[PDB]
Amino acid sequence: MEHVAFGSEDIENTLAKMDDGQLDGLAFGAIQLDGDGNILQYNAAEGDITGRDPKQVIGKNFFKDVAPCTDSPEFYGKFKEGVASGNLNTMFEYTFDYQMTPTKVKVHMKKALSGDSYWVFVKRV
Ligand SMILES: *C(=O)/C=C\c1ccc(O)cc1
């Protein structure tokens, strides 16, 4: 080793976020999902690295293989009424870390406009 390595994650989410490069999208963030809860962030506007996968979360259900905090059906009972209604629009909590570099975000989910889905921003706090 010397100055050529990495790990897995060292930010807060992915491409659609606060500020680190910024790209075409919304004005908050997004991870996007599908019917069962499969991440869709993999075909709309790639980040910026050019070498391999966008991240690794691809194909992994945000349900229990990406988020080491969501320990329930999905969010907190806000994806069974917002999905059936056809106008998801709810906020609560979700965090992102609790041992490395903690935080105190406030999540703002909605029935996506970037490509038909049920995203989960993170908001600016
Ligand atoms: C997600 O992490 C939600 C809650 C929670 C509560 C206590 C501790 O220690 C970690 C996480």
From Swiss-Prot:
Keywords: Chromophore, Photoreceptor protein, Receptor, Sensory transduction. One of its GO terms (molecular function) is photoreceptor activity. SUPFAM superfamilies: PYP-like sensor domain (PAS domain). One of its GO terms (biological process) is regulation of DNA-templated transcription. Residues 23-86 form the PAS domain. InterPro entries: PAS (IPR000014), PAS-like_dom_sf (IPR035965), PAS_fold (IPR013767), PYP (IPR012130). The keyword rRNA processing does not apply. SMART domains: PAS. Disulfide bonds: none annotated. The keyword Nucleotide-binding does not apply. Coiled coil: none annotated. The 4-hydroxycinnamic acid (p-coumaric acid) chromophore is covalently bound via a thioester linkage. It comes from the Bacteria. The modification S-(4-hydroxycinnamyl)cysteine is found at C69. Monomer. Belongs to the photoactive yellow protein family. Photoactive blue light protein. Probably functions as a photoreceptor for a negative phototaxis response. This is Photoactive yellow protein. It comes from Halorhodospira halophila (Ectothiorhodospira halophila).
